[PDB]
Design a protein around this nucleic acid. Structure first.
Ligand code: CA
Ligand code: CA
Length: 289
DNA sequence: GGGTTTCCACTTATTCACGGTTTTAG
DNA sequence: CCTAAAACCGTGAATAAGTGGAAACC
């Protein structure tokens, strides 16, 4: 094992995909103020893509990888001084989804802990206000212990895709390359490239159609950006990710996706031998892989 | 060393990735 | 008539986040 460096925009794009921040406020009787804290950033992936965590850790030289279950692997960046490396990276390469607001409050808690103010109750009360507008909110225990209020209202992030490398990192995490075999008589193979995201990023999802110049948005939360015209796929969708290399097992799925795209380009998908060969490539990829 | 950090094990709520069909476009 | 691109489904699980516990640090 040697690991490889990852494009920082592909990394920042992947952080927008599967990344997550954490801010812990735990009841600690041994603590002086009665509550200890832990701040950092984490990513949880499947064991099949554990190489990404090693390559992400090799690029930053921070964080630790530990098994997050029988079928999961996680990377946690909890060291305080090491968080400065993750912070300085995101300042130069900012987030574009609804996670940028979480990083803004991630810095707002690092600064409280930077001045060592997280040991006094007056400073701890500030950390309780930060946790409200971030994350999933405070638990019932933390809400009962602190009746004080916080006012900020996390505003919806309005940003645009900076470059293709961000899209490559985001699509590597939240993108799906599917080969659709529609059933019909006589003797249909369809290629679709869907991307699922929450309704909170509908501003980004709507801009994704104009950014690539194609696609339609389907419609509970949820959302979906789908492209089906083979002219757009073979000319605007497939060559974009070929220039900006992907990361993870989805690259091998993309590699097997281009093979079926070349057959449709040669129009050999109508042949029985071509359709049979597509079934072999389709079954040995995506969920079957 | 006495609070304080940082690390490992392990869990939980839901947005995912992903599949398959029925129906319209042209 | 024909193959294409669009529209509708539907769910399991890999996620996005979370806690308990104790070691390790200074
Ligand atoms: Ca996400
Ligand atoms: Ca994924």
């Amino acid at each position: 094992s040697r690991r490889e460096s990852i494009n920082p925009w592909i990394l920042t794009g992947f952080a927008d995909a599967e990344g997550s921040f954490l801010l812990r406020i735990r009841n600690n009787n041994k603590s002086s103020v009665g509550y200890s804290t832990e701040l950092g950033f984490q990513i949880t992936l499947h064991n099949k893509d554990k190489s990404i965590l090693e390559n992400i850790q090799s690029t930053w030289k921070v964080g630790v990888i530990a098994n997050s279950g029988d079928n999961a692997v996680s990377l946690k960046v909890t060291r305080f001084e090491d968080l400065k490396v993750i912070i300085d990276h995101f300042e130069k390469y900012p987030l574009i989804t609804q996670k940028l607001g979480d990083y803004k409050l991630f810095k707002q808690a690092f600064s409280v802990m930077e001045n060592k103010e997280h040991l006094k109750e007056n400073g701890i009360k500030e950390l309780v206000r930060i946790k409200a507008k971030l994350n999933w909110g405070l638990t019932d225990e933390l809400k009962k212990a602190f009746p004080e209020n916080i006012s900020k209202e996390r505003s919806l992030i309005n940003k645009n895709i900076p470059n293709f490398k961000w899209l490559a990192g985001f699509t590597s995490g939240e993108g799906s390359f599917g080969v659709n075999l529609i059933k019909s008589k006589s003797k249909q193979v369809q290629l679709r490239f869907r991307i699922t995201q929450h309704i909170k990023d509908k501003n980004l999802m709507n801009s994704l159609i104009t950014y690539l110049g194609c696609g339609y948005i389907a419609e509970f939360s949820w959302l979906q950006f789908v492209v089906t015209k083979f002219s757009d796929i073979n000319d605007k969708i497939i060559p974009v990710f070929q220039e900006n290399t992907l990361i993870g097992v989805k690259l091998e799925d993309f590699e097997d996706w281009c093979k079926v795209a070349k057959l449709i380009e040669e129009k050999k998908h109508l042949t029985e031998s071509g359709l049979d060969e597509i079934k072999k490539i389709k079954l040995n990829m995506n969920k079957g892989r």
